[PDB]
């Protein structure tokens, strides 16, 4: 996160840390959608051009974290993945089209004041809040600078959804209906963005109708971090909802 702020305690209880067993390292963000399911960007697991292809094995999930680095002695819960499921038509070859994946925890995790699942939007919910101008919230432990550190604590930023045309005109990469971009316009003089190391984290919105937090997007890709005339791109969760319903109903909690 660039131009963000430290998260408050218990501000984003569904935030999950994708952690590398060895070398022990922070891979990506993720999110808790129930006591046995985690949502992340498919590219955090599999990305052939960079020779990345992680297994259930190579991984650990840290839930209830605040501090990026310290082992949060009686607050965080670490888990093991029983299974990994990637979107069959995830396009790593060209544009990260359908940058989504589900992780099913070996064993169910218990809710506490620091660990709580985020809701998935319904058609109605998606419709009314996914509008250019409406502000969403992004969290991560990613780059603070495009290039310049790494935060001590979970960072947060509120960013407005941007109309598709502007999205499209900001890059040479091909956008699809499963993506949405967000950030401020250079004129709007207000800044901020997600950045490398922020992927798989959640883009969330609080419904004004029932005042529940919903996950609308997944941090996916960008060009640089916080540059004028550029936007962050997010996986369109509502759009991949059927796929999600499907794996959960097929082999899960």
């Amino acid at each position: 996160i660039v131009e963000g702020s430290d998260a408050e305690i218990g501000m984003s209880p569904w935030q999950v840390m994708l952690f590398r067993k060895s070398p022990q390292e922070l891979l990506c963000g993720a999110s808790l959608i129930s006591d046995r399911w985690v949502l992340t960007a498919a590219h955090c697991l599999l990305y052939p051009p960079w020779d990345k292809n992680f297994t259930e094995n190579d991984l650990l999930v840290r839930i209830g974290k605040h501090s990026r680095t310290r082992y949060e002695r009686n607050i965080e819960k670490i888990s093991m993945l029983e299974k990994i499921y990637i979107h069959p038509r995830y396009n790593w070859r060209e544009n990260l089209d359908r940058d989504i994946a589900l992780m099913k925890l070996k064993k169910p995790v218990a809710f506490s004041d620091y660990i709580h699942p985020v809701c998935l939007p319904d058609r109605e919910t998606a419709a009314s809040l996914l509008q250019a101008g409406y502000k969403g919230r992004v969290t991560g432990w990613g780059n603070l600078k495009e290039t310049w550190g790494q935060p001590s604590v979970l960072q947060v930023v509120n960013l407005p959804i941007v109309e598709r045309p502007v999205c499209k005109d900001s890059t040479r990469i091909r956008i699809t209906d499963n993506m949405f971009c967000a950030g401020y316009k250079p004129d709007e003089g207000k800044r901020g963005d997600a950045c490398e190391g922020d992927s798989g984290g959640p883009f969330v919105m609080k419904s004004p109708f029932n005042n529940r937090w919903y996950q609308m997007g997944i941090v996916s890709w960008g060009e640089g971090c916080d540059r004028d005339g550029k936007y962050g791109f997010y996986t369109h969760v509502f759009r991949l909802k059927k796929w999600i319903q499907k794996v959960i109903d097929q082999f899960g909690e």
């Binding site: 022990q24 390292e25 922070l26 680095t69 310290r70 082992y71 670490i78 790494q150």
Partner: peptide
Amino acid sequence: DFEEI
């Protein structure tokens, strides 16, 4: 960087 887990 990381602390012992």
